[PDB]
Design an enzyme around this catalytic site. Structure first.
Site, PDB file in Angstrom:
ATOM      1  N   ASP A 116      -0.502  -8.758   7.188  1.00  0.00           N
ATOM      2  CA  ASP A 116       0.165  -8.506   5.915  1.00  0.00           C
ATOM      3  C   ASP A 116       1.048  -9.676   5.504  1.00  0.00           C
ATOM      4  O   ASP A 116       1.203  -9.942   4.307  1.00  0.00           O
ATOM      5  CB  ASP A 116       0.989  -7.221   5.995  1.00  0.00           C
ATOM      6  CG  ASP A 116       0.125  -5.979   6.072  1.00  0.00           C
ATOM      7  OD1 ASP A 116      -1.082  -6.071   5.760  1.00  0.00           O
ATOM      8  OD2 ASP A 116       0.651  -4.908   6.444  1.00  0.00           O
ATOM      9  N   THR A 159       0.817  -1.209   0.000  1.00  0.00           N
ATOM     10  CA  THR A 159       0.000   0.000   0.000  1.00  0.00           C
ATOM     11  C   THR A 159       0.853   1.262   0.000  1.00  0.00           C
ATOM     12  O   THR A 159       0.422   2.298  -0.517  1.00  0.00           O
ATOM     13  CB  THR A 159      -0.940   0.000   1.204  1.00  0.00           C
ATOM     14  OG1 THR A 159      -0.171  -0.056   2.412  1.00  0.00           O
ATOM     15  CG2 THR A 159      -1.869  -1.200   1.148  1.00  0.00           C
TER      16      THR A 159
HETATM   17  N1  ADP Z   1      15.306  -6.967   3.599  1.00  0.00           N
HETATM   18  C1  ADP Z   1      15.016  -6.313   2.448  1.00  0.00           C
HETATM   19  N2  ADP Z   1      15.912  -6.241   1.440  1.00  0.00           N
HETATM   20  C2  ADP Z   1      15.637  -5.594   0.292  1.00  0.00           C
HETATM   21  N3  ADP Z   1      14.469  -4.972   0.048  1.00  0.00           N
HETATM   22  C3  ADP Z   1      13.478  -4.965   0.972  1.00  0.00           C
HETATM   23  C4  ADP Z   1      13.704  -5.650   2.254  1.00  0.00           C
HETATM   24  N4  ADP Z   1      12.581  -5.491   2.978  1.00  0.00           N
HETATM   25  C5  ADP Z   1      11.712  -4.768   2.226  1.00  0.00           C
HETATM   26  N5  ADP Z   1      12.247  -4.452   1.032  1.00  0.00           N
HETATM   27  C6  ADP Z   1      11.579  -3.670  -0.037  1.00  0.00           C
HETATM   28  O1  ADP Z   1      10.857  -2.574   0.528  1.00  0.00           O
HETATM   29  C7  ADP Z   1       9.608  -2.405  -0.145  1.00  0.00           C
HETATM   30  C8  ADP Z   1       8.520  -2.015   0.848  1.00  0.00           C
HETATM   31  O2  ADP Z   1       8.165  -3.143   1.644  1.00  0.00           O
HETATM   32  P1  ADP Z   1       7.326  -2.971   3.009  1.00  0.00           P
HETATM   33  O3  ADP Z   1       7.615  -1.598   3.569  1.00  0.00           O
HETATM   34  O4  ADP Z   1       7.615  -4.181   3.864  1.00  0.00           O
HETATM   35  O5  ADP Z   1       5.773  -3.054   2.578  1.00  0.00           O
HETATM   36  P2  ADP Z   1       5.079  -2.057   1.518  1.00  0.00           P
HETATM   37  O6  ADP Z   1       5.465  -2.620   0.170  1.00  0.00           O
HETATM   38  O7  ADP Z   1       3.608  -2.168   1.839  1.00  0.00           O
HETATM   39  O8  ADP Z   1       5.674  -0.703   1.818  1.00  0.00           O
HETATM   40  C9  ADP Z   1       9.295  -3.718  -0.847  1.00  0.00           C
HETATM   41  O9  ADP Z   1       8.952  -3.474  -2.212  1.00  0.00           O
HETATM   42  C10 ADP Z   1      10.567  -4.539  -0.768  1.00  0.00           C
HETATM   43  O10 ADP Z   1      11.036  -4.843  -2.085  1.00  0.00           O
END
Ligand code: ADP
Ligand code: MG
Lengths: 535, 50
Positions: free
Chosen positions: A401, A95
């Protein structure tokens, strides 16, 4: 013509917005909404405090809840509220990235409006560029359905650990990733698998620590037993490990018709006959349970004072004042059927429970019912604890989620590597097609490619990395090498490979990010006359 | 002596203009055209297409 001029009612509160300055106001307004959640994108993201008018506060970084229950005025940002709600309902994840991408499409289109291009012609190039980005990522999208169930279990862990890194649950991702995956495995069909999220329940409890949260298969009930002196734990005796759980929608009460009735009694004779009448009803209600061998009886309405101890002498525990929705979820896990009336009670409708004990929490007065199953059952229930009332509620949305990401891999096994790897892969595909066709649509294609680059630059900015050095490094490895696994690393490992970091995201989640963002900004560019009535 | 199905397709794509369907009209026109053919040619109702 006189001084009064009236056509539309209430001309004072209704204002008209038009012209080139109208497009400049609504585009720059949507950027302020994404700028708030811009720092909340990725694992480095930060939470947001939300205060309700009633005094209740909520702390979450999820763009769906942030935009929800928030007072707004401008109607453009209210469309972003419904945008995050659209991403949260079906997919359950992503989102935050959609609102940031939607505002990036408007910022790139704002400079194109001042160049003399019609707003629809700008939006028409976004739909054609979005189809080329999806077709490019689909070609490089790996299919994990060719493996067995052993490797498929570890594939769900890679998808769960990524979404849990941006929440407070990120403290230990390994321990709580099993709770999300193992809860889904129980309801999976093993073939043509459907998740059926309805069977998965989530019940939070405020207290203790988050490390005490454990996956329990059964039903959680907050209603205490009808009588205090019955034993807290219920265990089967000899064979037939099932406790013969009976679920009856009719409690123990004097029989009466639902319609209004009047019973006329004549003097002493009929008065004494009705006395023995009800005294034989309690003996008839208790013999039906002993005949079928049932033990625990639950019902919507509380038992009478005479029916409470009647079940105690026979060693028959009971629970009263159970909600109607709670009655249905119990019969599924126990493979039983709810008994409509006392005459229909039979051993085939009785439930099965491995162990049932009476939980107590600290010095507060409450009793939580815990149903357990020694074998795989139809339903699961999430048990979450926390040191704060908001941490419990935040761990609910964090675990919810995670369950929404696992179910996306059940229907569609196609997955992609996120963390800046998917956005740059789809961004360079549009730039290569813009120089070949040329024409007047080359500016709408470059604006769509530069808007996709905002997501990987946001992940690098929040993590401290240089967005200039990060974006230039990704385009070098993506163009030269056909491997698309290279992406932004927010945690600072020595390698930029997203495959070695166990970062896996569903394709249906990342596909809807461009779809929901492109379709929304097309209507925004089509909005010219803005009539806002004052309240 | 043309086909009756292709007659309703070209007329439906005209009303799709000025709307959000103009770009997506490929998929969306194939829907409404099949929606009117299910109804009886003698009795056409707007409540059933709700
Ligand atoms: N450990 C990680 N390493 C690399 N990329 C990450 C990691 N955790 C999350 N991301 C990236 O951050 C983005 C945001 O994820 P998140 O904040 O968990 O949920 P949302 O997509 O709802 O914001 C995702 O598209 C993902 O690709
Ligand atoms: Mg997420």
């Amino acid at each position: 013509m006189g001084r009064p001029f009236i056509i539309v009612k209430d001309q004072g509160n209704k204002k008209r917005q038009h012209g080139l300055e109208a497009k400049k106001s609504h585009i720059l307004a949507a950027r302020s909404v994404a700028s708030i959640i811009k720092t909340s994108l990725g694992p480095r993201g930060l939470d947001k405090i939300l205060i309700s008018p009633d005094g209740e506060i909520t702390i979450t970084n999820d763009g769906a809840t942030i935009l929800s229950q928030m007072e707004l005025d401008n109607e453009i940002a209210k469309l972003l509220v419904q945008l995050s709600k659209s991403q949260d309902d079906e997919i359950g994840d992503g989102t935050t990235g959609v609102v940031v991408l939607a505002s990036a499409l408007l910022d790139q289109a704002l400079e194109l409006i001042q160049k003399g291009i019609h707003p629809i012609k700008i939006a028409n190039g976004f739909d054609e560029a979005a189809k080329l980005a999806i077709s490019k990522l689909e070609e490089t999208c790996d299919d994990i359905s060719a493996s067995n169930d052993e490797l498929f279990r570890d594939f769900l862990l890679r998808a769960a650990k990524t979404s849990l890194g941006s929440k407070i649950v990120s403290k230990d991702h390994d321990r709580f990733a099993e709770m999300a995956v193992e809860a889904v495995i129980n309801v999976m069909d093993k073939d043509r698998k459907d998740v059926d999220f309805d069977l998965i329940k989530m019940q939070g409890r405020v207290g203790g620590s988050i490390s005490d949260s454990k996956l329990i298969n059964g039903v959680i009930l907050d209603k205490d037993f009808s009588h205090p002196q019955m034993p807290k734990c219920v265990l089967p005796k000899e064979g037939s490990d099932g406790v013969k759980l009976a679920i009856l929608t009719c409690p123990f009460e004097p029989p009466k018709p639902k319609t209004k009735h009047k019973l006329d009694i004549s003097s002493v004779e009929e008065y004494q006959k009705l006395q023995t009448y009800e005294q034989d009803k309690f003996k008839e209600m208790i013999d039906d349970v002993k005949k079928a061998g049932a033990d625990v009886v639950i019902c919507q309405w509380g038992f009478d004072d005479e029916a409470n101890h009647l079940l105690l002498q026979n060693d028959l525990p009971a629970v009263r004042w159970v909600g109607g929705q709670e009655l249905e979820h119990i019969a599924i896990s126990t493979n039983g059927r709810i008994v409509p009336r006392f005459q229909d009670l039979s051993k085939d409708k009785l439930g099965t429970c491995s162990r049932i004990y009476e939980q107590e929490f600290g010095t507060t007065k409450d009793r939580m019912l815990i149903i357990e199953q020694s074998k795989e059952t139809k339903t699961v229930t999430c048990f979450v604890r926390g040191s704060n009332k908001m941490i419990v509620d935040e761990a609910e949305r964090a675990l919810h989620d995670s369950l929404c990401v696992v179910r996306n891999l059940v229907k569609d096994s196609r997955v992609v590597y996120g963390g800046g790897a998917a956005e740059v892969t789809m961004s360079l595909a549009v730039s290569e097609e813009a120089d070949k066709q040329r024409g007047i649509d080359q500016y709408a294609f470059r604006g769509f490619a530069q808007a996709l680059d905002t997501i990987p630059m946001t992940l690098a900015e929040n993590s401290g990395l240089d967005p200039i050095g990060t974006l230039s490094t990704l385009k070098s490895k993506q163009l030269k090498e056909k491997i698309s696994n290279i992406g932004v690393d927010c945690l600072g490992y020595g390698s930029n490979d997203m495959k070695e970091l166990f970062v896996v995201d569903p394709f249906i989640g990342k596909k809807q990010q461009i779809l929901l963002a492109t379709q929304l900004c097309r209507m925004i560019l089509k909005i010219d006359n803005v009539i806002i009535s004052g309240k | 002596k043309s086909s009756g199905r292709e007659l309703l397709e070209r007329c439906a794509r005209t009303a799709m203009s000025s709307k959000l369907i103009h770009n997506n009209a490929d998929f969306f026109v194939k829907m409404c055209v099949d929606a009117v053919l299910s109804l009886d040619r003698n009795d056409l109702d707007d409540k059933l297409i709700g």
